[PDB]
Amino acid sequence: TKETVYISSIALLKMLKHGRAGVPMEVMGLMLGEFVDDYTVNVVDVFAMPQSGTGVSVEAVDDVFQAKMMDMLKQTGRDQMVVGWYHSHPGFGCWLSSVDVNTQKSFEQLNSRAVAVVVDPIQSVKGKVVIDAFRLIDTGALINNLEPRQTTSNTGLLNKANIQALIHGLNRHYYSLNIDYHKTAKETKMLMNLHKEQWQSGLKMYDYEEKEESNLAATKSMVKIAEQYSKRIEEEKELTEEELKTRYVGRQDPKKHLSETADETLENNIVSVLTAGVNSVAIK
Template sequence: MVSEKYLNKVFLASDVYAACVQHALTTERQEIMGLLIGEVDEDTYESHITACVILHRSDKQPDRVEISPEQLCTASMHAEQLAKKLDRPIRVLGWYHSHPHITVWPSHVDVRTQWMYQRMDPLFVGLIFSVFQNDTQNRSNQLQITCFQASERISEPERREVELVIKPLPFHKYNLEGIANLPRILIQEEVDCHTIKDSDIQDELANLHNDSFQTLAIVDIVSKVSKPLCEDLEDRRKALKVRIEALKRLKESFTST
């Protein structure tokens, strides 16, 4: 039986939001997933998400994602390391995944998965990023986000929406490293996927054919993820450099008077 404790509000750091969105936009064919790290105020039942862990998918599906116990353990170890580094009680407190081309609302499977996590931690929370939703009127893609928990019912758990607040914060090094590591994770997924598929194939032509598809997939990641990511980070670097120079001039104007 899950405790009747529910979150009142979730505060999501803006750099974590950027990392999750970047991850969600890497593919419009399968769902992606990750875990959320931060602190929970047990007095106010408010969750403060300050970091995320991008998970390696062993099985790519267009309509579902699963988190293995090994991945949960790895994320917990990452949270412990971050807690020691920051000297704060940081732990795994939620999960996120994407809904490409479909509504932002959690499915029955999502709600049941969330309910399972809440059996271990009543204040565990879920985020869903709906991406690649076409707005025909404005000819643009929409991005939506929902924050939810599961509430107990007699027949089956139901969705319970939680207020979400995005806190404007500068990029922290550990979240920037997570974004920079994203292409490596995606490439490793492709390598592992083709390695499993090709393990029992003895035909050289078939192996060559599959290797070609793996190469195409990796090139696609480089062109659609790595290159735009590098350009975005370079633009951020230039903007920060301009900001630093402006602040230096402002400091000089104050000291000269």
């Protein structure tokens, strides 16, 4: 059947960062891991590859550079068989790689588990993190092993699938894209201690103390003028409709200044009560 790729938190950040240099510029790298077909698939560690005159292509793979890396990657035990390659391209509706077309056919002969990954956004990520891979089916999808038994497959309904330009056939021969991410026990505690939403730690005692009470130099300074700002914001919209009917043609006008000055006041009170609430023990 097909293969479900499972990129961990370590491989996703490394494969992405290698292709973040330039919109037009294209690079490539090598993926390594140890797994078995029949669903499961892992990636241990990756590293970028040098760019040749052809850019991203089948001849851009250096057997001399690749052999030297596998010897240097043996010291830590991360040396494994070649599970595929990852590339970098600006991306399109179909065939995101502007060069590679049949290059995967030469890759399938070396390893049947090898894939070609292309990063569409190139620092355009809005938080979705959508990456594209490729696998050559060649002759298939008729009276053979049934791929779409795993997850999110048999797509192509009407003209809208994914980017909506691929529809059914996707890139070539309906490679049935499947991507999932996982986090181990070490990746769970490390990422939450480094980046979760925003990292304020290491300042933990001064976290909100220095950012607010010690930042009062100019932050909320002249609170009497800061309260005057909330006056002009409320007086503007409250003046609109005092008759509770249609006059100036508005709806949320009374709710506009409601939510804006509510969070500001909530921050004004918490910072002020914690000024003397830290209790630095000044005494005399």
